[PDB]
């Protein structure tokens, strides 16, 4: 149908919306920063059709400890006002904390195997997401947002991110040249990216899109990983390395700024970041990754 | 899957244009030179094997414009891709013999000629919509709908392609919304109040997927027919209704005035790095 009449400030053609950052990729995908969108228009457009957003999160082994804060903050900041379906992948269904949900929001616990090596726990997320795209997501949600659990929402994360396929700029590399990117550099690996290629370094902790595009991405990344495993190689940054190979050759239709994936302890709060939306929580890496 | 390509890395902390808005508040790209790498876009579109339709009306004396329109379209419009020109005319035998490059074809659609130039212009909406059903949905993937009294002077390519696009009218791109020449009479279906409006889109250049173009043209024609019943005709005819439609159904790309210009009236301002599609005297 049509949008209703709305009153908002006129977009000014001869005034850039940001003077300090790139707001569109060379393949004409928006790069999402505060200031580039009017959320009122986007919300109204989004309500033109009934649309449900799925959010996947893995809480395997000791990582169940992150769930309470993750969920409680998502309730405050994630797609508020819209239909949300949480999917918590865990080997401890009984360990999922009871979190009160707003109306139109629901949580499903998906029981899965717990791999021994943390590398495998992280990497197998691609296989598990892909499997469950078939089993459940295709029929239950229209978009999937796939994130790390060891995080909290601190500000708005809404429909501005939704698009057929998106990746997120990794906070450690947004200002870096491509040669400094930690892509897989061994040609023997499926994730290989040469020194003279690369658009951005995307973070493995935050990607998404339509269910079909996420199914494609995750299935492809899983297959590439299995080929490596057969060839006796494991990519330098695991699922993140394959994600980067995938997004290099299949360009995302939006790219999220590091507002959406940040660590304030390591990086502070630069002027270039007007909002800090989704951020790392403190953790002891050696301890939580092993029994 | 794209092949390996060697191009300059996009710079996250360097705006691609510092002088213009390159994305709308609804996250639709505004297409200016410097915003796109045409090599990446061409690769993306060639992998889809896309056919682009181009509609143009050459009714009565406007057949005179066809030769230059088609010759220059051959040099600048979607070069490298499949193109299907549709010439709507009341004089099939008056269409010039223009040789076309490979993968490019032209069909002549015989339609009626209205006496008033306002009606010729306005009835384009009805005729495009009708032919979406008759021809276009089966024959092309995108439709680009333009004025004939024009010539291509520089690249007009797949960067414009999207489900729905309008083009910034060259006379108003730097104006405030109160100064836009929207229909202002509440009696007309094209009415837009002074406190509404994003841009003033030009009637001479719009398009999108056949599905979206079918919806837009049908809607604009219906609106015009309601107005006619109410003894009113919009101030800028089809353009007024185009603007009403694009206000309430936001385009997924907006084309800069590089794509619709008149150098005689407006010169060549620094903000325009290229003049792509321009008025003929
Ligand atoms: O006997 C016919 C009749 C029509 N057609 C067909 O109908 C089409 C439209 O008719 P026209 O081209 O006659 O309509 P235009 O006056 O060109 O009108 C065009 O430009 C105007 C603005 O001027 C530009 C402008 C204005 C102010 C400031 C700056 C400007 N600037 O650009 O710099 C408005 O924006 C109109 O909406 C737009 O269509 C023709 O191209 C033929 O295809 C026939 O085939 N046979
Ligand atoms: O033992 C583990 C290891 C990892 N994960 C999941 O895998 C994600 C990525 O792992 P981690 O955060 O430890 O890696 P990082 O990218 O932060 O270095 C985590 O957020 C969890 O969702 C898990 O559930 N249990
Ligand atoms: Mn993490
Ligand atoms: Mn004209």
UniProtKB/Swiss-Prot annotation, chain A:
Give the record's keywords alphabetically.
Blood group antigen, Glycoprotein, Glycosyltransferase, Golgi apparatus, Manganese, Membrane, Metal-binding, Secreted, Signal-anchor, Transferase, Transmembrane, Transmembrane helix
| Binding-site residues, an alpha-L-fucosyl-(1->2)-beta-D-galactosyl derivative | 170, 182, 240, 263
- Top-level taxon of the source organism: Eukaryota
Q: What pathway does the UniProt record associate with this protein?
A: Protein modification; protein glycosylation
Q: Which residues bind UDP-N-acetyl-alpha-D-galactosamine?
A: 58-60, 63, 148-150
- Consequence of changing residue 172 to S: In allele Bw08
Q: How is it modified after translation?
A: The soluble form derives from the membrane form by proteolytic processing.
Q: What's this protein's name?
A: Histo-blood group ABO system transferase
What gene is this protein a product of? ABO
- Parent sequence residues shown: 64 to 354 of 354
